[PDB]
Write a protein that binds this ligand. Sequence first.
Ligand SMILES: OC[C@H]1O[C@H](O[C@H]2[C@H](O)[C@@H](O)[C@@H](O)O[C@@H]2CO)[C@H](O)[C@@H](O)[C@@H]1O
Ligand SMILES: [Cu+2]
Length: 373
Amino acid sequence: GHKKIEEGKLVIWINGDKGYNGLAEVGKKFEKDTGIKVTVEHPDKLEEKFPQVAATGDGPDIIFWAHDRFGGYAQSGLLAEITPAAAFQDKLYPFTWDAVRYNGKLIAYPIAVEALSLIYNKDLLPNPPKTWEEIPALDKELKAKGKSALMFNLQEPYFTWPLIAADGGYAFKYAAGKYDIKDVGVDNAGAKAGLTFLVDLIKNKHMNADTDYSIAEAAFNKGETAMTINGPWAWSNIDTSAVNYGVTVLPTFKGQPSKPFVGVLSAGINAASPNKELAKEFLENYLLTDEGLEAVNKDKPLGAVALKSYEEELAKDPRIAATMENAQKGEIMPNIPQMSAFWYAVRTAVINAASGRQTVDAALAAAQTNAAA
Ligand SMILES: OC[C@H]1O[C@H](O[C@H]2[C@H](O)[C@@H](O)[C@@H](O)O[C@@H]2CO)[C@H](O)[C@@H](O)[C@@H]1O
Ligand SMILES: [Cu+2]
C-alpha cells in the first residue's frame, strides 16, 4: 500500500456485511476479459478510513457504502464526478440516481435499495405482532418457554431509528425541496416517545443494552429469540440455519408505522484514482448487469437492486416485497455532509439512554445540538 493508488489495477472497498466474495467473482470475470487485476477489500470502519486515506491520494479506486456518506466525501473533494450516458442512466430507476446526486452532479453509481424489516421465526411465532406495544406481553409469554420476543443490534442507531422516527422523529426537515440543516428532529416529542419505549423495553428486561449485531444474529439463528430487525444482507446466514423465517412489515408505534432510513448502496470513484475509465468500465459493463448483480446477490442479498432488468426478477420474492413495503413507510437518507455528525450524535444518544448513563430527554437534547455541528 506504500505506492498510493497503483495505475493498471482496481482496488475496491465494501463493508464486511455485504457480498464481497460475489463482487470478487465479478472482479475475476473483469480480469479474465481485460487482464486488469481487481482486489476486493473489506476493512473495519471503512466509512471512517476512506476520508482519511482518500485526502492523501491513497485508498481504493472504488468505494461502496450507503449514499448517506457520499455528499461528505464529495464536499471533501474525494469523489470523481461520474459521466454515465443517458442510455446507461435509463437502465436504473431515477430515484436511485436522485440518492447519488450532490450539487446537481452524480457522485456515485447506485447498486441497491436497503431497508430494515421485521424477521420472525414462523415455528415460535406464526403470527408476528403488528404493534411495538404488544411486544412486552409476548416476551413475558415466551420467557416462560425459555425464549425472548425480540433481539436486534442496539449499538448502531440505524436499527433503533425506525422506532424513534415512528411518532415524529426526523434527522433534517425536507422543506421547499431542500434539507434544513438548522431544523433537526432528534429531541422532539415523537423521538422521545420512541427512545423512551426502547429504554423501557430494556428497564423491564425484554432486551439487553449490550446486544450487538453478532449476539442478535446468533440468538435468532439458533432460535433463542422469536424476532429480529435486519436487512437483506442478513438472509443468507438465516438460510444456512435451521430457522423457518418470515420477513414482514416492522411493528407500528402509537399506531404509526416504523420509518426505517432507506439506504442506496452506491459505488463512488476515488477522485485520486488514476483508473477512472477502468472503474467506469467495471461498474457499468460488469457489476451493473443481471450477471454482475446476481453474482453479488447470490453471496449476500442486495435488497431491491437499482437495475430495472434484474429488479423485475427479484420483485417476485416476498422478502423484497416486504423490504420495499418497509422502505415506502420510511424516508430515503439525506446525502448532505452533516449526516456523519447526525449519526455520531444519535449513536451516542441511544447508547447513553439505553445504558442508563443519561435520561432519554437529556441524551436526545445533547444529540440535537451535536447534530448541528
Ligand atoms: O448506524 C449508523 C449507520 O447507519 C447506516 O449504516 C448501515 C448501512 O446503511 C447498512 O447497509 C449496513 O451496512 O449496516 C449499517 C448499520 O451499521 C448508514 O449508512 C451509516 O452512514 C451510519 O453510520
Ligand atoms: Cu505497499
